[PDB]
Design a protein around this ligand. Structure first.
Ligand SMILES: C#CCN(Cc1ccc(F)cc1)c1cc(C)c(NC(=O)OC)c(C)c1
Ligand SMILES: C#CCN(Cc1ccc(F)cc1)c1cc(C)c(NC(=O)OC)c(C)c1
Lengths: 354, 143, 354, 354, 354, 143, 143, 143
């Protein structure tokens, strides 16, 4: 009961915190509900459909707010599972986290609005959408990629900004009077930005042939350099995901290493002939003919742990195999050095026996 | 030997409660939880498969005696233990500080008790240094 | 005749199933015929050209439907070649496959339409075009790439969706009254989607200078993140094709390994001096001075298999060579350990002889 | 004179064929002249500037045609340098090459036009521009990249084509009557192509809200998959250039290997003490106290060749070093096997001497 | 004081030259001030906001010019820190650098303008923005990437230029009369450029169905090849940044190698027993029971240097570890060769002792 | 030896039906299909080239006797067979279960009959374990 | 030995001015600047940590005597010195010209004086060549 | 030896026409074209730099006698020749057919004459096989 209560509290905390399986589907569903609420708000802003749009929006929003409130309640309550926070004091201390602060301010804003409203409602939709991530994983990945490729992004931005400024100014000079699109440098710069991005709205475009020619020559380079950052970020995303997977692989290696060492020590400390081993047998006795059975169990555990650790030593990379084999090769170098010393001793004895 | 074989038969009977000569996955699980540990049915399947050689899901006595008799020397655990300790060796120096073992040994996987880690350091701190060389440690384990 | 009939059935099954050479050209031609039928339907929808367009479309579509019917017939009939399905019962059992179900419903729908029609005809064209792949290879590749790079795609989608929502809402606030393009938030969201994608139709664009400025600052990031997924998917496509090629290379290695082992055993089991080898000579005798000829042919087979397998051990990758050389290095480690034992024995004897 | 004539013929052939240095600048200049001729043709097509544009174009085109004629003459004449083609017969045989056929038909077409003309002149400009490449290197690279990544390109094309067809048809259904942009399926297909490519002219766009929504949902995927092939081709271009550089590196290795082997043999065959070496000394004598000088120069050549070849064994790749070191490791394995045999012999003698 | 003056001169020179920490923020702030000056110029060009825009612009520009003048003064004055340039003559010689010429001409142009002006002011804004880089690092990176991938870029440009020319000409032929967008080939070529780049302004587009079809078939390829160079440059940027990081890593290796060798020699030259070591003890004496203290300090320095150098031997790359391990493997080969010769000696003695 | 060379001449005559001293590719194909197997012409070129040393498309008797006399040791099949079995070893344990051989040997490339695989396991299951190690197997093949 | 122990006690007293048996980081820094060189507090921390074995931030006398007694052989500087000289070997030939040492040794990291490089070349130019091989050079440091 | 020293002095005089004891790159080039071959100025520069040890642009007699006395063994050309032949070995079998040498030897780099390649095959075809192994061949060059 109480133990079951603690088990369920831990499971709920895991689900609400970083989940693995069906809790992932639950999070997908809550996100989908928020998304549908946002879509209904969109349709409410439409006039001809406003009636049914708002009719459904009110009930969907009440569902969303009750779900948010109960979710925050259960999150705070289950905060006691972790050893870091326990009890009511621990739950409050967990609530002191900035993310919980964000969630609670959003909740109170929603309850105040519900119990010019469209502006606040749409804002709060956006903030809850932001909150959906719950870990900053996407934001952390994006920031890490930006920092890693800082030089490429900075050079691309500098070159593209120079291209934008120069092209806009030259076109403005070329089309200052003839075309009413470029009456002011601000308009020309807006045109330059809309062109180099390849959006090309068409509300502003050069018509003077000198202006058209300058625009052509500059927007070639401009569109190239405005497209650069997207590709740079894509490559960086791929690289950073690869690195994160490598780290996860190495931690998945780290744990079975402990498992294998533990089982190996226990088995080496369960040999029947060897004495002074009671320090190990006592553990199993506390867990509880029997001695040989315990040795059998321990050796069985050691072999399974060995196999699991071995299959945990997957290459996963050229670097990995190279490193493991280089450790082996250093061992081999030491062995051949020892054998060199032994043959040196043999040749030194040579004079003695000759 | 003969007396060893008798002890082997005693162990097999202790496991093979039915006495049919084949240790069932359920018999192994029951004895295991009798000793005070709960495995997973899949885990029991993996272990039995590891020891299984006839592909039957159980173990006939010849396989059982071969399994008990398998001394660590023929197991060839030198490379695996070297690699594991190296994984836990964050420096690459070829050694490891005692506190690191005291923590990881007792906080990862099948965490060990204080007495176990104490005898571990006893048989590892032959030099009484604490910065035990894991390579020499696995060497002494093999012997 | 009957053996030739079975040979032709197998060849037809191979052609209709995954082909290699000229059957590839036949599939290209049937796809081209369907493509021309679709183009002629397009031209039929055009009014001024409707006459000749439909005149040719009717005959091209009759050709297409007869080709589809006969192709399905021969596919079902040749389904008996494979050991999985044989006989009329086997052919029906193969016909129960979902893909055959798709093809047959398409066939019956087309025949019913032939013997509001434009809607159904165009739908049927689209479904048959989908059916052209015949293996889901493109779909499987796309799904595998999406799953493999799930994190990068998800972060890109999340960031870009936030950028779209935020930019649309901010512009809508900035251009709510002044510009008639953004009378409703739905219009603003459509503009945001059309801009961040860089389509830039031009039917909606900001004109209020605050709106223009906000749009510029947000669509920079928006276009970057909307372009991300294309690059991510391109890189993932390349990676997955590389992995599939690696697997195919390793299977091309797998088969010659069996070939070499077989030939090597046979030759080792065809030695003239060695006895008890009749278990091998009997195979060649069943295939049928002659003994030495059998040994000659067997050793010739072994050598050709050896060279073929060796050329099949191409590096193809750093991982591959490293793995093979690491196996060799473990062998070398064992050898040096044995030689260490030998020198240990010699130095132990030293005292005996000294 | 005659020898100088042949030297200049070879130099001219090299310049006109694949050049390295200043001939590269000459080709750049001839290309620039053709480009300026095309630009002047463009300006001639303009009306208000037609006068001076045509005035300059006529003289620039006379210069271009005379340059083309003289260049073809010199190429044909210098074709005799290569051993493949010599003499007037050899030059004609070289002229039989298809590329020379392209050049000659272009020349005669230009001379006929010069001595509805705008159509032919612009065409001829385009064909000569095509001819500028002179080696198909760009075309060969593009074709090789397409073939290498055939699967990624094919899946991208299939998925994008399905997206285009489906989105166009769905929008046409949604916007058949309400919007006059999509009066026919052909118009809808043109809109789909102009949108998925992100060109977005703006002459056609959905206005019905259901149509707008369908278009948004489908053009997301459509633009992604229409952008795919560009990235795929970029990556393939990089890869193929890398592979070509690898092959060039290995040929740059191949030649110095022969150089080193030659010099090493000569030096080993110029040893003063060793006899029967006259077969080598005679070569230097034919080139012509002196014997020691011959040995000195020969060994000097060998050492410089060795240094150059060693410098030519740059890694350039992990594969390269791995291959070289694995060869060396095979020698090491053989040596340790020999030492294993020698220790086997020693331990076998042990019984004899014990 | 004077020593402190030199220290501050060196600190200021480092800050103004390539900085590391807070000087980076100072440069960011000066760049931001210039950027805000440019923004205020933009707003001044706007009419309705001209008053306050120019009011703030004048004061911000006076701040900018005084900052530029004082910064150039301090840079010239601190130029004496470096050993290359010292004294007034040295500072002038440093001022002879072309970059200082750019800065000084910009300064004098600004002072002349301040004490048609909009054209010059905007120009000088652009040149100062260019000058912000201070090292050409972005330009050097871009040029290096272009040169490295010269072949891919050249093939992409050639193919795309051919596509542009051909598509424009074909559309012009198709839309010469029917559509007034393409009255001249120049207009058609402008359309081709604006389309293949996917800008798609919408001011020109085909309307004749044959023209639309040709445009579709050609702009597919055209947009692909116009997008190519952006991806090529992105990949090249990533590669070049990686290579530069590799070089920086190897220099960070180069310095600790010297540190370790120095400390190792000094410790090896501080052994108490060994004599003739005063050549090392004298250096520490000049820096200044004490002898053993000196030995302890020197060995401590050696151990710390050894550790630092070892952590400076990070893999960082497969090639790196392969290089180090291949060196070691060469030593291993030499050792086994020595042992081969030694066991050869033993077997040769065998006959002697047999 | 002399008796061996006489047997070699008998074999050469059995192949070189023309008796011209050079085995034709067509002669080799004819004798092969007499033995009951159809090769491909190109396969015949590949094998003859493998044995060919004079670049003539045939084999004079010296090359033929060298081909027969080449014992497996000088062929140096150790590494190749090691690698092949390793390819078929999905575990990397250095062994392979019997059923895997029974399946693959009889279903890949030139599938072997039951008798051949039976003698294979006979000479490989010297330990009678079934999980035969390919390493010692190729060593015993060498000897 | 006993006399070496007394010398180490004199050194410890010279370092441990307080005489508490543990060398403080500040005591080490003070003596260091007395010899005429200023470290960084973090640098001193790194050194003490290197020699520290009890994780106390200071050094008890046992660790101190171990530090003095640690001959370079057990330090195993062969590979490290080899690799460093290799890094400075721009050719890979296995040698290095004298002028390169005269420059780098005196201009990188802890630049040394002329006399130091002179004795360096003296013990390096045993062959009197100038193009000293770093390999033999580190070897004769070992001996 | 003394007679070898006299022969080297004769060679130096033949080279050092000026008789100043230092061979000029112009002197070397003149004698070279006297032998009937033209180098490039840079080529002579690289040659002399290779033999140069004093960084002077000439060769004093000690360096010259060192160059004469430098037998190929101390040069350690084993690995280089092995690798070169491997590069020309398109198969990786460890051998190479005669015709390949006859072609490449006479058409790459410093093309060799018929006589030189004939003595090449003579000393390489010790077994008279034609498919000479480059490894044993460089070994015999060494000895
Ligand atoms: C980044 C960004 C925008 N999003 C996320 C988004 C989610 C919900 C929306 F309603 C709108 C947008 C986005 C972007 C692209 C290119 C695609 N297409 C694609 O992935 O092709 C492979 C998709 C499917 C979504
Ligand atoms: C994805 C997608 C659309 N398709 C497939 C398609 C097939 C038939 C059609 F009628 C229309 C489209 C497509 C896309 C691009 C970018 C190109 N251009 C290219 O590959 O340049 C390298 C091509 C040639 C086809």
């Amino acid at each position: 009961r109480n133990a079951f209560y603690r088990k369920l509290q831990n499971f709920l905390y895991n689900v609400l915190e970083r989940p693995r399986g069906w809790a992932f589907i639950y999070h997908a569903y809550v996100f989908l509900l928020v998304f549908s609420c946002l879509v209904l708000s969109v349709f409410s802003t439409i006039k001809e459909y406003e009636k049914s749009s708002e009719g459904a929006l009110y009930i969907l929003e009440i569902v969303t707010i009750v779900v948010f409130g109960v979710e925050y309640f259960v999150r705070i309550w289950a905060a006691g599972c972790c050893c870091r926070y326990r009890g009511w004091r621990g739950r409050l201390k967990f609530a002191r986290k900035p993310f919980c602060v964000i969630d609670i301010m959003v909740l109170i804003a929603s309850i105040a609005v519900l119990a010019s409203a469209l502006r606040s409602l749409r804002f709060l939709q956006i903030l809850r959408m932001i909150r959906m991530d719950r870990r900053g994983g996407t934001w952390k990945l994006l920031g890490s990629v930006v920092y890693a490729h800082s030089k490429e992004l900075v050079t691309a931005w500098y070159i593209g900004f120079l291209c934008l400024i120069l092209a806009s100014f030259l076109v403005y000079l070329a089309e200052k009077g003839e075309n009413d699109h470029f009456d002011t440098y601000a308009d020309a710069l807006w045109w330059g930005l809309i062109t180099l991005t390849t959006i090309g709205y068409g509300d502003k475009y050069p018509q003077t042939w000198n202006g058209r020619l300058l625009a052509a020559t500059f927007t070639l380079i401009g569109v190239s350099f405005f497209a650069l950052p997207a590709g740079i970020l894509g490559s960086g995303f791929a690289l950073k995901v690869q690195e994160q997977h490598r780290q996860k692989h190495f931690e998945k290696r780290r744990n079975p290493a402990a498992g294998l060492i533990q089982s190996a020590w226990r088995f080496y400390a369960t040999n029947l002939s060897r004495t002074d081993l009671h320090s190990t047998w006592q553990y199993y006795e506390r867990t509880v003919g029997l001695k040989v059975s315990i040795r059998a169990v321990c050796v069985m555990r050691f072999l399974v742990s060995k196999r699991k650790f071995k299959e945990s030593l997957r290459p996963y990379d050229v670097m990995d195999v190279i490193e493991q084999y280089s450790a082996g090769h250093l061992d081999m170098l030491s062995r051949i050095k020892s054998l060199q010393s032994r043959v040196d001793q043999i040749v030194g004895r040579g004079p003695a026996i000759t | 030997t003969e007396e060893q074989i008798a002890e082997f038969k005693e162990a097999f009977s202790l496991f093979d409660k039915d006495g049919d000569g084949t240790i069932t996955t359920k018999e192994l699980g029951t004895v295991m939880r009798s000793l005070g540990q709960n495995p997973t049915e899949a885990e029991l399947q993996d272990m039995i498969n590891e020891v299984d050689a006839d592909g039957n899901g159980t173990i006939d006595f010849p396989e059982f005696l071969t399994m008990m008799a398998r001394k660590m020397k023929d197991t060839d655990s030198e490379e695996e233990i070297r690699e594991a300790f190296r994984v836990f060796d964050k420096d690459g120096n070829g050694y490891i500080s005692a506190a690191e073992l005291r923590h990881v040994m007792t906080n990862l996987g099948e965490k060990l008790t204080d007495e176990e880690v104490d005898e571990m350091i006893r048989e590892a701190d032959i030099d009484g240094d604490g910065q035990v060389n894991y390579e020499e440690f696995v060497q002494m384990m093999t012997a």
